[PDB]
Write a protein that binds this ligand. Structure first.
Ligand SMILES: Nc1ncnc2c1ncn2[C@@H]1O[C@H](COP(=O)(O)OP(=O)(O)OP(=O)(O)O)[C@@H](O)[C@H]1O
Ligand SMILES: Nc1ncnc2c1ncn2[C@@H]1O[C@H](COP(=O)(O)OP(=O)(O)OP(=O)(O)O)[C@@H](O)[C@H]1O
Lengths: 223, 221
């Protein structure tokens, strides 16, 4: 019952769920990433869904990639199929999920007889920084988050800026409202560190939003 | 019934999959090992991280396991990645070397899993007849120059291999690491792969080389 699988999307919440699972002495048998063909997927994220391989390699944990069209409800089922093929007793995911996701996750879990573990934005983000998380902003979609944020690493100064934007424009500290997206380059659990060698940011002025596409990165020893 | 196919992305891996499907096996997973040991006698390493693109074309879940390449960790690292799968057996390419076969049979036996394994000139001609679109991404044998990197293995190319087999004894099927390949298209593939950017890296010190596929995308068919 300690054998679990963590739904991993590469961001700060997925990596914290993983941190959490291991710290609570759970046995994360697999990292599971769903690769949706549809960009507007309601269940899964597409951002850096191809870079998870790097994090999995840095972690040493087996990675399971499932491929789906990303259609409304057909998605939950696709996950179900992938999960039923794994020898696990439970599944972990980031607590920042939504009632829509949370509900559907719990649904498939009950259909497979699996437990569902889901572990203040300010104390949260600060906790991640104190745990050694190296979070890089790879997406922005909210007034106050200009293109300059793309690719920036979230430290204490950065967090203080977000605080200011929160007071001025109601920007959620931890991006709970989807103000920005992230990708974890390093964390104490990573055996190696992810180093971005080349990347480009795609910007859309029609909605004043953008993303940092990492198109070249490697791993570096940590000792 | 339920099995996992050891998939490296090469011709033999792809034929193992084709073989398993046609023989009424239920391919629940494709398993790709990623090793840091560029010169391992266990796994094909060139473009090892490209299987994701093929798996996406097939519509079959992929399991990526990792290993530093230490020969003393070959069995335990592969075992770690298979032990957690609800499978009754595993499929391996029919051309797996003895060095490989032993390791595979050991890990299988330790997991209680079965091992399913499917004339070089005949074997190759069949793959072409089956519609396999094979690109050479690595070579290492006297007689094989850099011109082979990136080349598409068609009937014309096969005859050249047969010729080289006569002249320098090069293995027509590439066993023993003589050459490595990458399957761009196959019948089971829903989409075909197209290479958009690649880098040829030649090793003069051993007169060998490899093609690093840098960019690629799926195209309709
Ligand atoms: N593509 C995906 N594949 C598998 N699990 C996913 C995927 N996307 C999200 N999840 C899981 O569901 C949770 C909710 O993700 P959500 O869409 O809210 O974005 P997020 O919280 O920013 O993602 P991340 O955990 O990477 O930070 C994640 O914490 C993770 O466990
Ligand atoms: N990285 C790997 N991960 C999982 N299985 C592998 C890996 N490398 C080899 N194998 C398995 O062992 C067999 C032998 O590998 P080999 O390199 O000879 O063939 P291949 O990779 O399938 O095709 P080719 O040699 O033409 O590139 C494969 O058929 C496959 O089943």
């Amino acid at each position: 019952l300690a054998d679990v699988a963590v739904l991993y999307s590469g961001g700060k919440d997925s990596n914290y769920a993983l941190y959490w699972a291991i710290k609570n002495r759970f046995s994360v048998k697999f990292l599971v990433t769903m690769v949706s063909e549809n960009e507007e997927s309601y269940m899964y994220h597409t951002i850096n869904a191809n870079l998870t391989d790097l994090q999995a390699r840095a972690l040493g944990i087996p990675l399971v990639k499932g491929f789906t069209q990303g259609e409304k409800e057909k998605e939950v089922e696709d996950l179900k199929r992938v999960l039923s093929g794994l020898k696990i007793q439970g599944i972990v995911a980031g607590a920042l999920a939504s009632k829509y996701q949370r509900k559907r996750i719990e649904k498939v879990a009950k259909e497979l007889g699996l437990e569902v573990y889901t572990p203040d934005a300010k104390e949260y983000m600060r906790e991640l920084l104190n745990l050694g998380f190296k979070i890089m902003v790879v997406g922005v979609s909210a007034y106050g988050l200009d293109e300059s944020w793309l690719g920036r690493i979230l430290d204490e100064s950065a967090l203080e800026e977000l605080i200011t934007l929160n007071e001025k424009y109601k920007v959620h500290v931890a991006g709970e409202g989807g103000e920005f997206e992230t990708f974890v380059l390093d964390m104490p659990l990573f055996k190696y560190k992810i180093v971005v060698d080349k990347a480009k940011k795609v910007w859309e002025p029609c909605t004043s939003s953008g993303k940092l596409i990492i198109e070249e990165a490697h791993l570096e020893s940590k000792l």
